Structures are given as C-alpha cells and as structure tokens.
Design a binder for this molecule. Structure first.
Ligand SMILES: CCCCCCCCCCCCC[C@@H]1[C@@H](C(=O)O)[C@@]1(CCCCCCCCCCCC)CCC(=O)O
Ligand SMILES: CCCCCC[C@@]12[C@@H](CCCC)[C@@]1(CCCCCCCCCC(=O)O)[C@@H]2CCCCCCCC(=O)O
Ligand SMILES: CCCCCCCCCCCCCCCC(=O)O
Ligand SMILES: CCCCCCCCCCCCCCCC(=O)O
Ligand SMILES: CCCCCCCCCCCCCCCC(=O)O
Ligand SMILES: CCCCCCCCCCCCCCCC(=O)O
Ligand SMILES: CCCCCCCCCCCCCCCC(=O)O
Ligand SMILES: CCCCCCCCCCCCCCCC(=O)O
Ligand SMILES: CCCCCCCCCCCCCCCC(=O)O
Ligand SMILES: CCCCCCCCCCCCCCCC(=O)O
Ligand SMILES: CCCCCCCCCCCCCCCC(=O)O
Ligand SMILES: CCCCCCCCCCCCCCCC(=O)O
Ligand SMILES: CCCCCCCCCCCCCCCC(=O)O
Ligand SMILES: CCCCCCCCCCCCCCCC(=O)O
Ligand SMILES: [Ca+2]
Ligand SMILES: [Ca+2]
Ligand SMILES: [Ca+2]
Ligand SMILES: [Ca+2]
Ligand SMILES: [Ca+2]
Lengths: 646, 646
C-alpha cells in the first residue's frame, strides 16, 4: 500500500512504480503530462487532482442529462388546456425560476470541468487539441440559452446536453470512435440493403397491380416500398398479404420467399458485416490502447536508464520491486522471470536489459500475481480497522432464505391478516446475511467491496435490508410491500453461488461480464434515444390532443396505445423503446403519418431503424458473440494450460 | 475425359484415377465396397448403377413428400358440410381410388431404392448397419397403409414419409447428425433459459398482485408465465404492460429492464452457445469427411504399392497423370510439385514416396488446376457438337433491357390498349439473350451449364423466354401476363456480374454460396414443418368451422386471420410459416387455447418455438456468420497470397 502522491517526490527509484501502476489498471495520462512536467513542476499534481473530483463530475453529467425529462414540453404556453393531462406524463415540469437554478449550478461545474485542463495543459496547447474545441463551444451554447431564460428559434438546448454527456465520458467516446471508424462500412451496405428492398418492392407492385391487392393496399408504387419495408422487419406479417392470399392461394409463394431472403438471408448478412467490421475497429482500439502502454513504458524505461545506453543493470530493476510492494521475498524470482517470456538474451546473464524486454516485463507480472492489493488511504487517528465447506455451508442459507419468500407469498394467496407469528420470521432473516461476508475481512482482506463482482452489484442490496426493516414498526403502507419484492436479489447472489457449476460455466462468466462490458455500448444507445426523443418532442409536441378527430380513426386508438404519445420527453423515451424492441412498431408509423397528415413523418421512424439496427446488431449482438468466445476459450485453455503452468 | 466405368477394367494403372476422381468431387463409397469387391466382382458395377438412378430417386422423394398436401383432411367423412369450403384450402384432395395409384407407384421405387444395396452389400451385412434397419421398417409401415385401403387408429402415414425423406437424402442426414451431436448442449441451455423465465415470471406476479395488473391480466401465476413468455419473444410488447403502465408510470422500469435481459442479453447468449456448439459439431463432420478421404486414399496408395513396402517410385506415379488426363506438360512440374505443396523428404530425390506423402499429393492438385473437365458422354453417331470488353458489353445489354421493362410498366400506368408498336419491342428482346452465352462454347467449353453458378440458377429462366413468347399470338391470356411479369431475372443476372465491384465483393460472393450451402439446413426446417403440420392437422382438423361461436370472440376473427387455419394440410404449412417468422405468432396461441378450450394447446406452439429458435439460431444465423468469414478472408488473403501463389 504505497503512496499515490508519488510522481511528486519523483525519484528515479520512486516515480517508476506509479508509472508501473499506470500500466496495470491502465489509466491514460495526457500527452502534455506524458512528455514532461511533474508534481515537482506543479502540473501533475493537478492531474491527480482531476481524478479526485471524478465522482463529482459524473454526478454532474447525469444531473445535466436528467434535466431533459424534467424540463417542460416544447409548447406549454401556446397550447390550450395546458395544466390538464390529456395523456401526458407523470413528472412535475420545472418552473422557469426553478429552471434557472438547476442549470446555473450545472454550468459552473462544467466551467470547472472544461477549463480544469488549463491547470495542466498550456492555453496555446489546450485550444489546439481540437477535441476540446468541440466541447468548449458546447458550453457556450448552453451559456446562451441560460441567458435567454435569464433574459426570460426552437430552443436547441437539449441536443447539446447529450453531446456534452457523450464526449465527457471516456467510455462513450471510445464507443463513438467505433462508429465513425466503421460507419463507412455500414452505409455502404445500407445501399445494397435498399437495393433489395427497391427491387423486391417493385415486383410486388408489378405482380399485384391488376388484382385485388393493388386495389386494396398496393395502390401507389410508393405504397409498396412503404409496406414491404415493414415486412422486412416482419412486424406486420400476415396483415399485409391477406388479400393477396385470399384471392389466390398461390400468391403465398412470393411472400414466404421474400421474408426468407429478407430476414434469414439479408438481416443476418447485415449482421455478418457489422460484426466483422466490428472486429477491425475493435482491434484498432486495442492497438490504440496498447500503443498507450508502450509509450507510457518508454517514459518508465527512460526514467531508469539514466546512462541513456538502452541497457539497465538487473539489480537496478530488481531493487524497485520492493518499492513496487508486489511480492514479499525476492531472492530468485527475476531469474525465473527470464524463461516466462519467450527467450533469454543471455549475452550478459543479468547486465543487459533492452527497451522491449522491460516492456514485456511489467506487462507480464500483474497477470500472474495480482498482489498489489492497494486499499484507500485511511486516517489512523480513528484506526477503525478491527484486527467449499463454508461454501457448501452458505449454499444452504440462501436456499432456505429463498423458500421463506415463497411460503410468505403462498400465505398471501391465503391472505393472512395475522402476520404476528410470521413477522417473527420477517425481521430475523435480514439480520443473518451480514455475517457471511464477515469472515472475508477476518480471513483475507477488508476493502473487497470493489473486488468481487457480486460486491460490485449487491453492495447496495446487501445493506438495504435491515434499514428497511428498521422503519417498519417505528414509523407507527405502500412502502411496506416495496421491501417485500426487494428481498429477492438473494437469489441473484444464489445465482453466482449456483454459478460455480461447470455445466453452465462458459454461460456463467459471460453474463457476469455482460453488465460491465455493455454499459457504454448500451449507454450510447440510451444517448441515441435522447436525441430522437428531443427531436420528436419538438416535432410532435401537442399533437395527440384530447379531442383530435384524426386520432380515433387510427391504430393508436384501436389497440389503445393512447399513451406513450410523444407528448413530452419521458413519454417519448418509453415510446422509442418500443420502436427499439420492434414490438408493433408500425403502429406509430401508421399513426403519425395521419396525425401529421404527411409522409415526411415516415422519415423519423426509418432513420431510427437504420441507426437502431446498426446499433443493435453493432454493439448488442456483436459483443455477445465476442464476449462468449472470450469466456469460452479461457475455460478451454485453463485446463489445458493448467496442465502446463500447474 | 476418360471413362467412369473404370474400376471394372480395374488395373493398378487404370483404376487409380477413378479413386483419384473420388477425392476431388468427394463422393463416398460404401465400406463394403471400400474393403474389397470390384467391377470384376460385379458389386462395383451396381454401385455406379445406383448413381445412374439418383435423379430417379430424388424425383420419387419429392413425389412421396408432396402427397401430404394432396391427401385429404384427417376428418372429411365424420365432418358435416364436407364438400363446402369454410376457410379451407385450394387443392383438390385425392380420391381414395386415385390415391393408391400415387402410392403403389411410390412404394415400388422405394422397394427398389431400399433393397438396391442388396446388390452390393451382403444380406448379413445389409441388415446390420442399423441405418437400414430404421429405413426398412419405415417401408413396412407404409406397406401396412396400402393394406388399409382394402379395409377402406389415426392413420399415422405422413409422419413416416418425412422421416423417409429425411434419411434418404445424404445432405439432410448430415444435417441431422449436427442436431443430435449438439442437442445435449441446447437442452442444457434451455434449462438456464427456463430459469430466467420462471424467476422473471415470478416477480411480475409478486409485484403486480394487488394492483390493477393482477386484476386484469396477471390473474394466476400461470397467467404470468404464459404472458411473460410471449414478451420473451416480444411479439406482444406494449399490450401486456399497458394497465401496469396506465396505473403507475414507474412500472415501465421493470419491463424495459426485462426485455433488455430477455432479448438483448439472453437471446444472443442462446445464439452465442448454439453458434459455438455448431463449430465443434461442424468440425466433427469435416474431420469425419476427411477420414473418408484418407481411408479412400489408403485404397489408392495400396493399389499402386504392390511391393507392399510403403515406398513407390516416382515414375510409377508420374505415368498415371496422363491416364489421369490432368495436365499436358507433366515431367517439368512434378519436380516443382515437390516444392509447391510442402517440404521434400529428399532421402531419395524421387524413389521414396511415403503413405502420407501421396495423400498430400492428390489432395492439393485439384485446387490449383481444375483441369479434369469431364463432360457428359455423347453418341458420336449424330455428332451434334459444332466445331472485360465483352463483359462491359454485356454489362450494357441488360440495362437497356431492364429499362425497357420499366417503360413497359409506365405504359401500363398509362394503360396502352395499342401495344402494336410496343409489341415490336416485346418479342425481340428474348431472341437477343441466347447469343451472349454463345461465345463460351466458341471460346472455352461446351458443358458449362453445370459449371457457372449463374448457369446453375438461370438455365430454366434463360430458355423459358422465347417459348413463352411463342404461344403468345399462335394461341389465337392470364398466363401471358405473368410471363410479361417474369421478364426480370435479367437483373438477377446483373446481381452476379455487378459484384466484381470490390466494394460489394465479399457480400454477394457469400450470397451466391448461401443458396446451395443453406439448402439442407433450410431443407430440414421444411421437414420440421411437415412434422408440425401433420400433427396440427390431426389435432386441429375441423376446429375453425363455419359457424363456431367461440371463434368470433377471438383474435383470428378480430384481425381477420380466418385463413392460416390448420383446417387441412396446406393451410397449416402457411400457418406454421408465420409462427416461424414470428409475425404476430401469439394470435394462434391465443386462439387455439380457446378453440380447443384447453391449456394443452399451448404445448404445440412452445414446442414449435424451442425447436425453431434452436433451428433458426442453429442453421440460419450461425451459418451466415460462418459463411461470411469464409468469403471475407479469402478476399483478404488472395490479394496478399497471390503475390506468393503467383
Ligand atoms: C440501456 C439504458 C441504460 C441506462 C439506464 C437508464 C437510466 C435512466 C433512468 C430513467 C428513469 C426515468 C423513470 C420515469 C418514471 C419515474 O418514476 O420517474 C417515469 C419514466 C418511465 C421510465 C423511463 C425509462 C425509459 C428509458 C429506459 C429504456 C431506454 C434505454 C434503452 C415516469 C415519471 C413519473 O410519473 O414518475
Ligand atoms: C423455409 C420454410 C419453408 C416454409 C414452407 C411454406 C411454403 C413455401 C415454399 C418456399 C420454398 C421452400 C410453400 C410452397 C408453396 C406455397 C403455396 C401454398 C398454397 C397452396 C395453394 C393450392 C391451390 O392451388 O389452391 C409451402 C406452403 C404450402 C405448399 C404448397 C405447394 C403448392 C401450392 C399450390 O398448389 O399453389
Ligand atoms: C431495381 C429498380 C426497379 C424500379 C426502381 C425505380 C422505380 C422508381 C419509381 C417507379 C415509378 C412510379 C410509378 C407511379 C408514379 C406516377 O404515376 O406518377
Ligand atoms: C430505405 C427504403 C425505404 C425507406 C422508407 C420507405 C418510404 C417509401 C414509401 C413511399 C411513401 C408513400 C409514397 C408516396 C405516394 C403519395 O404521396 O401519394
Ligand atoms: C435518403 C435516400 C432514401 C430515398 C427514399 C426513397 C426513394 C424513392 C422514394 C419513393 C417514392 C416513389 C413513389 C413514386 C410513385 C408515385 O408517387 O405515384
Ligand atoms: C445531435 C445532432 C442532431 C442531428 C440532427 C438534429 C437536427 C435535425 C432536425 C432538427 C429539427 C427538425 C424538425 C423540422 C420540422 C419542424 O421543426 O417543424
Ligand atoms: C434513410 C432516410 C429515410 C428516407 C425517408 C423516405 C421519405 C419518403 C416520404 C414519402 C415520399 C413522398 C413525398 C411526398 C410528400 C407528401 O406526400 O406530402
Ligand atoms: C443521432 C442522429 C439522429 C438524427 C436523424 C433523425 C432526423 C431525421 C428526421 C427527423 C424528423 C424529420 C421529419 C419531420 C417532418 C415534419 O416536420 O413534419
Ligand atoms: C425461481 C422460482 C420462483 C418460483 C417458482 C415456483 C413457483 C411454482 C408455483 C407457484 C405457486 C402458484 C400459486 C397458485 C397455485 C394454487 O394455489 O393452486
Ligand atoms: C418454458 C416456460 C413456459 C413454457 C410454456 C408456458 C406455459 C405456462 C403458462 C401456464 C398456463 C396457464 C396456467 C394454468 C392455470 C389454469 O389452469 O387456469
Ligand atoms: C416440459 C417442462 C416444462 C414445464 C411447464 C411449466 C412448468 C410449470 C407449469 C406452470 C403452472 C403454474 C401455475 C400454478 C398456479 C395456479 O394454477 O393457480
Ligand atoms: C416424427 C416423430 C414424431 C414426434 C411425436 C409424434 C407423436 C406425438 C403426438 C402425436 C399425436 C398427439 C395428439 C394427441 C391428442 C389427439 O390425438 O387428440
Ligand atoms: C417445452 C414443453 C412446453 C411446456 C408446455 C406447458 C404446458 C402447460 C399448460 C397449462 C398448465 C395448466 C394445466 C391445466 C390444464 C387445463 O387447464 O385443462
Ligand atoms: C419434430 C418433433 C416435434 C414433436 C413435438 C411436438 C408435439 C408436442 C405437442 C403436440 C400437440 C400436443 C397438444 C395437443 C393437446 C390436445 O390433444 O388437445
Ligand atoms: Ca542503465
Ligand atoms: Ca541470466
Ligand atoms: Ca386489433
Ligand atoms: Ca512401390
Ligand atoms: Ca527430388
């Protein structure tokens, strides 16, 4: 547990292992900080000062981002019957005086966050870096629209807030490289997609003109490209070609041939491209990540080789491993570390250490050990640190804790009003579970809240139990059953302890890693909806009124989806989700073609679909196939290389 | 172009290249024929006699298979108002006298086809190989049903006909190995799938008991596992959780979390397993194919090495290459073939040829050359054989022929009754197209009807044109309209020729390969429907009547799907197709739960789904990802490897 304020004493001995820390967890530092400048030079202090306020910044980034539900409609005041809810949302819309407060607080942190790299980049460099120049200008745009409501065309604030939220996060920008690096391949294949629509849209207009079909549905040619596009999605499958089938039965041979080519041949081949084009772009990000590693190791190799000859004595590099605080006794480990990499140079047995050799060294060590084990810095003035047989024992606990609920809920079909003997069993079970995590700080380590992936995900849920049980009878109702389903992620911990089964073993570790790995790649799509909603709120604001007469003819009134409606922002975010899932997405396309009365409404849903069935095929479906083959072959090699490494 | 009747002269010199032919196109021969027995022993004659009647057999296998639409309903005669059509099909159902004519002729070929391996396998061997023991017994079951004609429980004929059709074809059996070799992995993951239905079905029953939701939809717990299964398919997405959403808006955060786990995380991970389990089973079929190759080369290496020492002089193997009819200037490249394929042994420069070395020889030759070029052998007594500048030229030919069609159809929106100057342009264009294939027999070769993949697919449509134009004015109406509509495979010939474009190069080189590669793997699924139809015809025969009162309440009458009906066989095959595509598949599950009045109807559609979303994820979607990476890397390698392949 060495220091982190460590590139500021900055010895050749000392400042190495901070750089060696920077390879293992792999955080970047700026190329301005990578070239020169130290914590003695009062710039690298501000680098680690930035990472102190990181949780301050991400608290702001979602604070800015979640304003978009809470801000009002595009047209509250032009609209009549404004305060009523004619199928509007739930949220309170913030008043204009309240609107200012939540933004001025928001902007001032951005003005810190955007101009904090002045403290460790030069102003003639900071304004040159051409990534900030986007982000700086986005701040100015909010600074305008705050001033407009301070002074009190269509208020283009919320599009920018997304773009601020996309770029600021390191993960979403790293996602966003994989779009623009690959988007030349997707729009490429979008043509040959559109070709086998237009050709196959045409033949149905050719074949079915004089029959009942062209009389009924396929009136225009443009009626077909409209319809046959929906059948490319197959979310309207038999309703299209009933009167083609009802007239002649042999007309089915067309449509069942079309969808086969449509779904089963093309849409997979769209996925075949995008998953294949993913691999090249992912390789460019990985190699772009690994060039960061060697370029940071070049600063590390130059920090030691002060003779500047490119060869370092071994005792010069052995001695820093205790300062590395990696392993405890070091008599002959580095002699073993020669054969662990491919070849020994052995021109001198110890004296010659080449540039690429040490770059292989620090990269190798953290894989085998994971022994750095660094906790957070504590004050010793309190000193609060208190100084599968058990696995099969805790296999039994979450069994009987689970069946306690199903007994409680088969009491609820009996509807016991006398829960007095059953409330004896209620409060006791939450008191139990805090004891099975207790041996871990007795056996191995204290700060493993951030270590086990279960403690990454259950740590709220582990501690939320008895604090919910506390205000049960001391509050002397709706929040009472709020716990009564919350006491069920016990099975989710029972999942992982059942997930030691070797029969499920590859499928286990993917779905574990599937939550952290696909958090940016689903995070970007959540930002994409925040674009499409804020378009559609402004396009379709007060459109579905209370008494709109074009409404009740259409499909939203037939199937009674007279909710989601786009009539403000959080109503829109649900509505784009159904268009994401493709559950009956042609209702809205059929509805807003009538509620706007125009065919330029069809633009909004197709432009969703193309970018969606890029992004669903891009980052959902192509990752899982990459993520499984990561988790599969490790299990396939851990037995085989465990025969080697032992 | 030597003979094929060639292992019956059966020289050590001669009968080699017939075995060398058997490696190149790779047909199997039986292990009885592989062990011993020759065309002198007459058994090898019956082997090639079998492959003469191959097209006779596949003409029978679809003849037997297509009786199942043409055979009648399960209950014509118990049903009242039998001859009327109350949402029944189109086909004429075969009369019982005319039925047996189509069956006795069918069976007599099977009795040839099943007992033809008597002629080249011993009877104590033929009844031992346990493929036949299935297949012979299936013949007996049909032989029963012909006796049932003279008598005039539920007539289980048509299930067997599929099983006969599956096993007889070599491709579908090779598909069917990949099921049973992998089905232990799929049902393995089906349980862990079923768990994250049940648990996620459970919480929605837990959450929504006291609210409006459990009052309205989620009445039973079994009501939820019913509903939440449909939302795993998302073919009923907002209709489920409207009254959960209409009451509390926060209930959406459940459902949008469920489908993400449901579709985007699980269903890909089901596809991740099945595509990964595909690779191992496909490797077993490939290695099972390649063991056939070396074991056939062992008979070839033993045919030459008559000294039985395992080493063959090169002039013994040089001399047969002219009998192979492979290449013209032989002795200059046979020394280069030492250097091209692999490394030379060079203990003797030519004298020593090992067992595995010759196995490397004949394997590599057919790749580089393709110079065997075997035609269909003619009688010379008639002697009917008559003894990209052009590519950019025939690029232009279809274009002006294509725009002639769209001019003809924009005449039809004008509706010209005077087609007399326009019929000058009609008949002339079909006469043109037979001339662009004509240089191929002048430049390169005659029998390339089976060689170019375009001539594999266009050859019916290439020649159908002028014979459709012939009976236009000499018949002095509805049929010649469709021929006017048929004038469109020209752009389908443009599809192949245009993808010399490197921008689209890999994509349709897949799609070319995609039709023959996925012909068995879609063929099996077509057989799977012929199982599920013949179940559902017998289960649901006269159910959707004319005046059924339970019918008009349900969804098939609401959305007017009163076709797609199950009330005979070909209504079923359309109907299972919609359940295959997943276009509104919950209508039938909602309908036949009412029209049978029972909950055991739900079995039929779920058991469809699990086997289907095996087989769609199995053999559609896993192939295209395998097939693209076959087509992609060959384009990626040949540009670099052609500098080495030279
Ligand atoms: C893939 C997405 C990962 C990111 C997770 C989303 C974080 C943002 C959370 C949104 C919370 C809004 C809840 C709204 C209810 C409330 O109680 O306030 C409410 C809005 C309905 C649900 C909103 C979620 C829609 C977007 C999620 C799905 C898209 C992501 C792909 C109604 C307001 C009320 O009356 O209380
Ligand atoms: C992949 C999967 C498959 C599915 C199947 C379905 C269908 C298709 C085929 C495609 C290719 C493979 C089919 C065929 C055809 C159709 C049609 C139907 C109708 C009937 C009508 C009759 C009269 O005429 O009336 C299948 C379905 C069925 C079959 C049938 C055949 C024949 C027909 C006619 O006849 O038309
Ligand atoms: C593969 C391309 C085939 C056809 C694609 C081009 C067709 C473009 C427009 C077709 C004509 C529309 C017919 C009605 C228009 C009108 O009468 O004004
Ligand atoms: C990418 C291919 C298609 C994308 C979107 C499909 C929209 C094409 C359908 C045409 C709209 C209706 C035709 C206009 C006829 C009219 O206005 O009278
Ligand atoms: C962004 C590019 C996509 C282009 C969108 C579709 C291109 C063609 C538009 C379809 C209109 C054809 C309708 C003509 C027939 C008619 O109006 O009567
Ligand atoms: C984050 C980049 C945004 C991408 C495109 C945003 C702006 C495109 C269209 C904006 C408003 C379009 C609506 C026009 C019709 C109307 O306002 O009534
Ligand atoms: C990929 C971008 C999607 C392309 C959107 C297609 C737009 C076509 C809209 C209908 C076409 C007919 C235009 C006439 C407009 C009108 O009738 O008012
Ligand atoms: C994240 C980038 C997405 C931007 C692309 C979506 C914008 C395309 C169309 C938006 C609405 C256009 C149709 C509105 C017509 C109208 O004004 O009535
Ligand atoms: C992960 C599992 C959670 C629960 C799964 C087991 C539930 C099986 C049946 C639940 C009880 C059904 C309630 C009504 C039955 C009745 O009273 O007849
Ligand atoms: C593979 C998981 C589910 C598969 C099929 C889902 C069927 C479960 C739904 C239960 C049916 C209705 C409940 C019975 C109650 C009753 O008899 O009224
Ligand atoms: C082939 C195995 C699949 C098993 C099919 C589903 C297993 C459970 C069946 C659901 C019935 C539960 C309904 C109980 C509640 C009630 O009826 O009141
Ligand atoms: C090819 C193998 C067939 C697989 C299973 C076939 C037989 C299973 C069920 C057959 C009939 C089931 C219908 C029972 C109810 C009824 O006949 O009324
Ligand atoms: C994988 C196989 C599919 C499993 C099929 C689930 C069958 C459940 C059917 C409903 C369960 C309730 C049984 C009561 C029958 C009845 O109400 O008549
Ligand atoms: C190719 C193999 C598929 C066989 C599996 C399908 C058979 C499962 C259920 C068939 C029908 C069962 C439900 C009928 C109930 C009834 O008799 O009313
Ligand atoms: Ca040195
Ligand atoms: Ca050494
Ligand atoms: Ca309806
Ligand atoms: Ca020899
Ligand atoms: Ca030699």
């Amino acid at each position: 547990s060495e220091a982190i304020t460590h590139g500021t004493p900055f010895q050749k001995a000392a400042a190495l292992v901070d750089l060696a820390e920077d390879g293992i967890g792999l955080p970047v530092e700026i190329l301005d900080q990578s070239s020169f400048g130290e914590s003695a030079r009062y710039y690298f202090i501000f680098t680690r000062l930035d990472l102190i306020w990181s949780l301050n910044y991400f608290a702001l980034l979602f604070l800015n981002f979640f304003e978009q539900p809470l801000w009002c409609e595009k047209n509250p005041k032009p609209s009549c019957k404004d305060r009523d809810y004619y199928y509007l949302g739930e949220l309170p819309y913030l008043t204009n005086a309240e609107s200012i407060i939540y933004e001025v607080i928001t902007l001032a942190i951005l003005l810190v966050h955007t101009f904090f790299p002045i403290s460790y980049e030069g102003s003639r460099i900071f304004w040159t870096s051409r990534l900030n120049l986007v982000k700086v200008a986005c701040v100015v745009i909010l600074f305008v629209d705050v001033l407009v409501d301070f002074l009190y065309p269509f208020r283009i604030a919320p599009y920018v807030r997304v773009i601020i939220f996309i770029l600021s996060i390191r993960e979403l920008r790293d996602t966003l490289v994989l779009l623009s690096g690959m988007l030349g391949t997707y729009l490429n294949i979008l043509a040959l997609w559109m070709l086998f629509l237009l050709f196959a849209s045409w033949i149905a207009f050719v074949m079915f003109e004089n029959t009942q079909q062209g009389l009924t549905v396929f009136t225009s040619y443009g009626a077909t490209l409209y319809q046959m596009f929906i059948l490319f999605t197959t979310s309207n499958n038999p309703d299209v070609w009933i009167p083609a089938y009802k007239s002649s039965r042999w007309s089915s041979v067309f449509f069942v041939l079309y969808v086969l080519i449509g779904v089963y041949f093309v849409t997979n081949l769209i996925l075949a491209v995008v998953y294949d084009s993913f691999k090249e772009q992912l390789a460019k990000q990985v190699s772009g990540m690994d060039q960061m590693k060697r370029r940071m190791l070049e600063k590390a190799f130059g920090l030691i080789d002060s003779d500047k000859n490119g060869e370092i004595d071994k005792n010069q590099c052995i001695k820093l491993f205790e300062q590395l605080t990696n392993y405890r006794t070091l008599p002959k480990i580095s002699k073993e570390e020669f054969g662990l990499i491919f070849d020994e140079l052995d021109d001198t047995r110890d004296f010659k250490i080449n540039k690429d050799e040490f770059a292989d060294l620090c990269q190798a060590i953290a894989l085998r050990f994971q022994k750095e084990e660094v906790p957070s810095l504590f004050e010793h003035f309190p000193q609060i640190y208190h100084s599968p047989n058990f696995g099969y024992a805790i296999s039994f606990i979450l069994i009987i804790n689970f069946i306690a609920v199903v007994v409680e809920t088969t009491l609820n079909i009996e509807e016991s009003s006398a829960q007095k003997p059953w409330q004896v069993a209620e409060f006791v079970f939450g008191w139990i579970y805090v004891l099975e995590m207790a041996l871990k700080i007795y056996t191995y380590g204290f700060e493993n809240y951030w270590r086990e992936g279960a403690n990454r995900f259950d740590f709220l849920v582990t501690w939320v139990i008895v604090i919910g049980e506390t205000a049960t009878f001391i509050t002397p109702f709706s929040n009472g059953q709020w716990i009564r389903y919350l006491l069920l992620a016990r099975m989710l911990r029972l999942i992982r302890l059942l997930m030691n089964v070797q029969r499920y073993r590859a499928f286990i570790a993917t779905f574990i890693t599937l939550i952290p790995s696909l958090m940016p790649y689903l995070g970007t799509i959540f930002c994409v909806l925040c674009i499409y909603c804020s378009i559609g709120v402004q396009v379709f604001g007060g459109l579905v009124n209370a008494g709109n007469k074009k409404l009740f003819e259409t499909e939203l009134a037939e199937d009674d989806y007279l909710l989601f409606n786009f009539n403000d922002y959080p109503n829109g975010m649900v509505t784009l989700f159904n268009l994401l899932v493709m559950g009956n997405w042609q209702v809205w396309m059929e509805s807003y073609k009538d509620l706007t009365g125009t065919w330029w409404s069809i633009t909004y849903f197709v432009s969703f679909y193309v970018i969606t069935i890029l992004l669903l095929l891009n980052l959902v479906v192509a990752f899982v196939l990459e993520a499984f083959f990561t988790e599969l072959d490790l299990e396939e090699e851990e037995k085989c290389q465990g025969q080697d490494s032992q």
